[PDB]
Structures are given as C-alpha cells and as structure tokens.
Amino acid sequence: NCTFEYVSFKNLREFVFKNIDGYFKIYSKHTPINLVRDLPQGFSALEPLVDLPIGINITRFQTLL
Amino acid sequence: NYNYLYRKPFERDISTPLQSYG
C-alpha cells in the first residue's frame, strides 16, 4: 500500500483521463463561456498535463467537492 | 531464502494465494 505519490455559468474546465500500459494520462483545458445551459457547440482542443506509471487496474471512479 | 514470491503490460497487484522460492 501507499506505493506512489506526486505533487505540483462562466468557466468550463475540461479533462480526459485514460490508462494505457499502466501509464495514466490527463489532458486539460480552461475557458470562459457565455451559454448558460451546458457544453457549448464549438471547438477547442485539450493539451496534456500529466502521464503517471501508476500500474493499477482502474475500473471505477468518483468526484470530490 | 523464503522472502521472494510470485503467482496486462506493466500491471501490478499485491492482493492475496501466492507461491514462493526456497
């Protein structure tokens, strides 16, 4: 246990989380928005941030606030 | 020595049920 550690509407924050060969990749983008309802019909790509050799079998997730 | 033991690419799991050397 405890085998790894790392440290470092008006806005939309976007992510992608994916696991390949035990490496876990996070992409991101932040933007202003003007549409009140939900995800705006437009286009803007996400850059990579993080790429971790965690080696775990991820099958579920949850969100914190 | 008995400390060494065994059972996707670069996957890991230490949960256990396990074999070992001598």
UniProtKB/Swiss-Prot annotation, chain B:
* Function in brief: Attaches the virion to the cell membrane by interacting with host receptor, initiating the infection. The major receptor is host ACE2. When S2/S2' has been cleaved, binding to the receptor triggers direct fusion at the cell membrane. When S2/S2' has not been cleaved, binding to the receptor results in internalization of the virus by endocytosis using host TFRC and GRM2 and leading to fusion of the virion membrane with the host endosomal membrane. Alternatively, may use NRP1/NRP2 and integrin as entry receptors.
Protein name, per record: Spike protein S1
Q: Where is this region: Immunodominant HLA epitope recognized by the CD8+?
A: 1-7
Q: What is the lineage of its organism?
A: Viruses, Riboviria, Orthornavirae, Pisuviricota, Pisoniviricetes
What happens on changing L5Q?
In strain: Omicron/BA.2.12.1
Q: Which consequence is recorded for altering Y6F?
A: Decreased HLA binding to NF9 epitope. Increased binding affinity to human ACE2
User: What happens on changing Q19N?
Assistant: Reduced host ACE2-binding affinity in vitro
Source organism? Severe acute respiratory syndrome coronavirus 2 (2019-nCoV)
What does the subunit section of this Swiss-Prot or TrEMBL entry state? Answer: Binds to host ACE2. RBD also interacts with the N-linked glycan on 'Asn-90' of ACE2. Cleavage of S generates a polybasic C-terminal sequence on S1 that binds to host Neuropilin-1 (NRP1) and Neuropilin-2 (NRP2) receptors. Interacts with host integrin alpha-5/beta-1 (ITGA5:ITGB1) and with ACE2 in complex with integrin alpha-5/beta-1 (ITGA5:ITGB1). May interact via cytoplasmic c-terminus with M protein. May interact (via N-terminus) with host bilirubin and biliverdin, thereby preventing antibody binding to the SARS-CoV-2 spike NTD via an allosteric mechanism.
Residue window of the full protein shown: 448 to 496 of 1273
From what superkingdom does this record's organism come?
Answer: Viruses
